[PDB]
Amino acid sequence: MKFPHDFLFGAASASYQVEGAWNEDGKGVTNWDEFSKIPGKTYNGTNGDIAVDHYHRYKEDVRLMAEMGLESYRFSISWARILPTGDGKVNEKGIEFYNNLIDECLKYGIVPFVTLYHWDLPLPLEKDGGWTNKRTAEAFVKYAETCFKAFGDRVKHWITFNETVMFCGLGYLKGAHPPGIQNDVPKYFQATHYVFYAHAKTVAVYKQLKQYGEIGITHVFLPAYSVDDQKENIQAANHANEYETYWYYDPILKGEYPSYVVQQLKEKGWTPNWTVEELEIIKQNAEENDFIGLNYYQPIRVERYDMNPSFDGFYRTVKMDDWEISPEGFLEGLHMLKARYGDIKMYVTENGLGDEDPIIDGEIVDVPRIKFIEAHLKVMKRAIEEGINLKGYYAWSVIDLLSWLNGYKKQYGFIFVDHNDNLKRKKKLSFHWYKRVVETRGEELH
């Protein structure tokens, strides 16, 4: 029974990706409801209108989780369900729905771990400039407090933000996510700052509520490596790590932003409009985080600009062989995080494989996914023996869901959803395997 009992095995979803019922029970419009209906933005013009219909089928879905012997379900609350316009009047039917989702998980002894913001911002607040406006950060702490008050007698594991890197990076640098802005780097760093503000402030609010759960943020964890032993390439990697780890992980865990990158934003005219009050709140609540969430998929191997580019030129990523796999990459990454942040408590809050799942006689035999998960689970076992403080694993995607960009195409998850048969669910091969892995508590030889 090798993983300890205070380690949770789980699976994850996000609201807009699974829920559907986009205009039901008083849900406000959100940024993604609008953005996905701009032609050419999303694969086949796919819609979060219905998604996988999880709103209406939640009792069913949680049953399947129960039958999986899932210990924890990580899901996201839709802000537009609780507070439709972002602030103002609370919507009692949003609270009714999430109370039911929570109570159902709980019937079966499944631990809700709630993500407050997984990219689905109510529209008014997007048009305010979203994360580039302090307003949106202040609206979020008010929203968070509403969820704590409503759900925190039962919910005792809370995530504020999923993957700030992406919703700021994709919306202001690459323009792939709303609001669709391209190479506006000062807005990007602004966005990240007001988010880190909203977080640390929300954490303060939570501790004041005396609910005695745990709270933390969940970042992309994209550990970066020099393509070889060359100094100029190792320099590129340090740079990579400064911008892609330290900028994200330092403000929340350490309470200070990292001076390397701060120096460079000043020297470029890219420093966000930040104030002492804000930076102090961030400073004062860094020690108040109970854990860090990691969304790990791959490392990145890098070489320098002269030697896929990074938003400041300087380095590029390169595919080669010493999308990427690398259990070795993930593990060294973990130690890299322990050296800097200490014995911080870690939840691998996403990890899994997107695929065109192989189908045989109507069965889904997703052995790539099993092999992906097994490999990472294996090195987490090593990591724990090597001292890392990992206390949970959340395979990205409990149930097939709507990709933001790629519609339905690259399945994620354990429960298959049948688009040809009224979105009927079916256990995949990974479902049966993971159930066994939970019951064995990860005894797959170590």
Numbering used by the authors: 1 to 307, 325 to 339, 347 to 470
Paper text:
In summary, we have characterized a novel PvGal-ase encoded by ORF1119 in Bacillus strain HMA207. The active site is located at the bottom of the pocket formed by loops of the barrel, a characteristic of most GH1 enzymes.
Structures of the ligand-free form and PvGal-bound form were determined at 2.5 Å and 2.45 Å resolution, respectively. The crystals belonged to space group P3221 and contained two protein molecules in the asymmetric unit. Because the structures of all four chains (chains A and B in both the ligand-free and complex forms) were almost the same (root mean square deviation for Cα atoms, <0.6 Å), below we describe chain A of the PvGal-bound form.
